Amino acid sequence: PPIISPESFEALRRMRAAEPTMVAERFKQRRKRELLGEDGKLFIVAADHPARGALAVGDNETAMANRYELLERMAIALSRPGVDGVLGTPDIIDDLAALGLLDDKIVVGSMNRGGLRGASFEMDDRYTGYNVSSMVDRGVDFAKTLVRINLSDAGTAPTLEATAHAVNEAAAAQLPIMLEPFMSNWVNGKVVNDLSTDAVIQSVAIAAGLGNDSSYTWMKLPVVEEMERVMESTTMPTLLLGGEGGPDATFASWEHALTLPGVRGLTVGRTLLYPQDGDVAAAVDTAARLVHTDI
Amino acid sequence: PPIISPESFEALRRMRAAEPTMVAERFKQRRKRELLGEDGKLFIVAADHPARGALAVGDNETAMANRYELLERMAIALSRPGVDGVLGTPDIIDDLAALGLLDDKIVVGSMNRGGLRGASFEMDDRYTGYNVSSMVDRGVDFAKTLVRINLSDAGTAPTLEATAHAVNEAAAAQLPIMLEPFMSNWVNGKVVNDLSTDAVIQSVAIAAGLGNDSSYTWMKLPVVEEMERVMESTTMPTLLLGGEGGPDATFASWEHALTLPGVRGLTVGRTLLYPQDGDVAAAVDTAARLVHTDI
Amino acid sequence: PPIISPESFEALRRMRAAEPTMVAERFKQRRKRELLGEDGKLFIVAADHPARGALAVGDNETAMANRYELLERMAIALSRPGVDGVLGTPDIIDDLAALGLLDDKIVVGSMNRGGLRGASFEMDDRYTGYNVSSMVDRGVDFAKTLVRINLSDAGTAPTLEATAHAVNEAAAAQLPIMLEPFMSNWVNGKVVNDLSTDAVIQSVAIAAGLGNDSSYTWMKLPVVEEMERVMESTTMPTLLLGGEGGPDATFASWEHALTLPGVRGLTVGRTLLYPQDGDVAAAVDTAARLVHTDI
Amino acid sequence: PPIISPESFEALRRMRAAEPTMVAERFKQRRKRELLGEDGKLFIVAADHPARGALAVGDNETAMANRYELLERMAIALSRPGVDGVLGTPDIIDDLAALGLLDDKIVVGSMNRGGLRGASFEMDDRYTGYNVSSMVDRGVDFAKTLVRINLSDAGTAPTLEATAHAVNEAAAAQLPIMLEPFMSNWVNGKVVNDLSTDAVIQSVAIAAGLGNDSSYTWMKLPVVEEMERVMESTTMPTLLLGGEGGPDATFASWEHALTLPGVRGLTVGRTLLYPQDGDVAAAVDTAARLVHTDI
């Protein structure tokens, strides 16, 4: 049985059209919760890919292209016990908020989506989404940024500076800010993130230094080879991401990394929503029971 | 018998040189109306092309080049029952304002016209027209932006960011903002919008994510192949546009798309004004009865 | 006998050097007048070319190079009945002011001179002179901008946006702003304005759309082929300019265009200051009698 | 037994996660001291390299890559008598602060880290770390900037201007600001600082002139050939840096330069932390006794 009835969607569409003020109102009447629960772990489902022009999972066009299904898959994930929140661009969060599915959940807002997938300028990842001002006003609990560092692309320069400014603002507002770093290179006209252990470590050392106050910054890192060595890179709270996809082996790598010093949980998207098979509720539970061992 | 006598036009010119404050005065004394009527549909005639250096329809030079005829054709459209409003640049609106043609009408203001037609820099569509400040002050009811996304042109970058800023301001002022997205490519030295179903869908996913609050943003989309699939791209209120031209087949495609979830009406220009045959009223009427079934 | 005696120039020099405060003081004690007289026509002499690195008339170096003669020729023009005012950069206006020659005259300030003549960057015409703030404070009556639109030169982009900002400010301050549009192309490494009828029309449609309020904008257009057709381009008050030079034929073309709808007068420089024969007063009077026909 | 225990690091990781406010609080409760002691000399240990993407010492990857060891090595240095303070990016200082290791110490904050090591854009060293605002608020005692001047790289331009702005702010806040100048060139695709006597002198003359008030600016120079001649370049307080590494000869060169007019001490990192032998305490003490001879 679907979490969102076609009747609720009629109300959502109908709301944005004639009662736009209700989006913000329902957002603020939202029941808030502490960032960290009793077990100090966090599990967040991500869906900020579309806004960056990335609808693929294994299926290019479809998958994420259909916003109604994206919302349904999200609603399912959020209904499963263990999921603390969601990460999304303003258009995704407002819908979920309007639908009333964000009570007692953690909302993470994606700030920059400028570096569109496949763009000649995707290293110049400009800040096009949430900004601290709107997050503070709306009550989102967490901020997130994508910081891809391409040494041979001048576009990285303005991105490093803009990220530093984002941290300045986030820290000053005492708003936790999640940075997703990567060392990236142009290979055959496409951007490929370097997932080697040393590259990840170098990206963390760089990202950690961005901002005039790094007391509210978290790391969103990829589970890579030799992960206890990558974790010796920072003292900052870290959340793991589940990229491309590959299945049991994937969950196993997370389980191991999840035990490392400083790791506080997961912030996965592509893999949990749109699993290789047809069972979102199942995939989300696995991950969930991996983060919150229900002690 | 023209809706606009040469006397009215004499009064228009004279006023602009003699009583500039009057333009604003007549604009504010304008009778306002609710955005959405009883049937919740909207039909708007567009004429913001000239300011972007695009006077063609099938006739390059002429057509739109003559501002007096443009205004007449507009006056006719606005006089026909069913037309809720007009979309134009400040120069266009001011004239329709001082000519007393704006009663009970919805005014949409074009914001960016920098990406001139045929320019080497037309992907760098800078904000050269209306801004939220002047719209709020003047009382325009709707804001509109052109967001062409060209993955191989760096000019797209600053346009994405400027559009995000426009939405920030529009949302904060609770001013509905209409975004016209497109995926565009350079082909033989000219910019061509990709009207394939998947391109339109990708452009919507990107545009929707622009801004720090997307609770006041609408979509202005082209009627394309497989349109019920394009509409599964957003939950946002959508208005259809009638590009180039082609006639009965055109109206038929609109009629079908007009039934899709979330579609709220039309925002057409080139086709309704400057109809192939000689009758703006007839063409404007055909579309009007398609948007408002006179229930 | 010159309108300005060396004793008077000596004082001008002494003042600037020894008591700069007197320039602004004499400027504000200036007797002001209504923009439009009883016949609603306007005749302004222009001299803002030097600041743009353009001293030629038919004579490259000399002509305008000598500032003292430029001022004399200006003083003569301003002394002839019929001349309502002058257009100049701050350095030209201040001198004419400190010399006490601006009483009961309309002052027009040149805003942008960045696009220097012969520069590889002359399409990037930055705002280097008067700004609305100083004009409002000083009491200048009119603002003027050069808006050359070169479709193949990226420099046009920032110029369009800066011009839009100038109009924003001018309109908000209720300060009339004169835009001089042109379509320009690079030909043999030099910038040449396209004076064909259709190009002028296209430039007007673009310029008219610049700004968030176009209720205070005027047009400064070149007398071109088929001018009653160019005038069907806008409803805005227009002033004619006399470019290069060529003499009786020139005055005749102005006389004809001067009868067209919306044309309010002249804003000529090179041709009346600097006449082929040397008689400024004669040249000026001819022009004046064409503007104010003593009706 | 390490200065920092596993228990304190765990305490740290947990503070950053659940009590982020404690970082700033512990920072402000910090016991402050006068900039210059009784002997007027200063000895500061530097560790702002990681944030710039430079983890090497003789060992590329490792060395600085492990943040926990970096902090330990820092804790050791700070515990040795003679060390007045530390220079670091916000992430480094924050950890030390939380650890309770900055009492009676001088804190210097690295301002720009944009010019990443190995980047095509490393001459465009943007301001990505501490800014005067956060330093004044937090109570850091000193500001530091890297000013590499590459005559053939346009990126130097914005760096010179940004550095000037940093000095403007630092001076206005009466915050001492340390500039590390260098003349740099591209050699075989890599940036190499010119350590010749004349290059260092030229860099000082340039750096000294940056800012609208140079009454709070210090110099951080490299010990080079003919150093009493380099010191005849400025009247400003200078601190010496220990670059690459090379050992006894190194200490000897410092000892000599340390006697020159205007030299006030050391600000060394790579060499004292990460010495060729396994002894941070030994290396640090040797340096400390070179700065404060205990008169």
Add this chain to the structure above:
Amino acid sequence: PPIISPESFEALRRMRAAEPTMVAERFKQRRKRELLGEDGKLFIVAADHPARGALAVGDNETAMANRYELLERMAIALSRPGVDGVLGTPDIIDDLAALGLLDDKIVVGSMNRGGLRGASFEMDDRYTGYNVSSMVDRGVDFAKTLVRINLSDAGTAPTLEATAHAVNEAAAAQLPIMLEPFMSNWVNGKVVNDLSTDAVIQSVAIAAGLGNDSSYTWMKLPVVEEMERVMESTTMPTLLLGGEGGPDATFASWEHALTLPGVRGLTVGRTLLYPQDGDVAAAVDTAARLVHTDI
């Protein structure tokens, strides 16, 4: 017998190090004087070259490289009767101020030094030194700018605009501002100023037009061929500069130009300081008597 004793210099360094507040204090306790004396002439010694990376005079490296000798040579010049003041970057002026050599002297601060000598970007002469704010606060009496205009170098564009802004601020603060214009070209990879009569004239016409108020702007021009014709370029107070060097012939050209309309004196550096021989006092007294005929 040096003007600045070594005990004075030691006191200067010690001040910059432990009492930076004193620099500003001694600067403000400075005895001020009227800009123009009884004879209305002005003689200023310049030393803002180092900050621009230009230490040469005939001797590359040395000459200006030694800041202590530079200050001594300056102290000598300032001690000679007839020298009204000095032009320098903040680091230069502060030292003199702290050394107490600025009483009853005119202080001119150099604003821009970004266009470093030999840089690929030296036409992009950014504002890196004094700004109006700090000059007004400190009490400097005059502002100075270098405005090199290179028609084939895009870097000139931002320099023209930044200069215009400097004049805006200087005029608004009623602070005299000195502009040093030049037409420059790239010749064999190096920047060479065009000293032909017509080029100088063209540069003046351009510079004079920069700013929104040119009632406080002066000209700093080079003594060139046909100088009474160059002076017919402006009505603005002018000061002559002594470039490269060449000796008796040089003084003679100044003496002649010094009689021209509008010329108010000298602002020379390279030549008076570091004379071809070892007689600073002798070179200065010559220049002084030339500007101030003891009357």
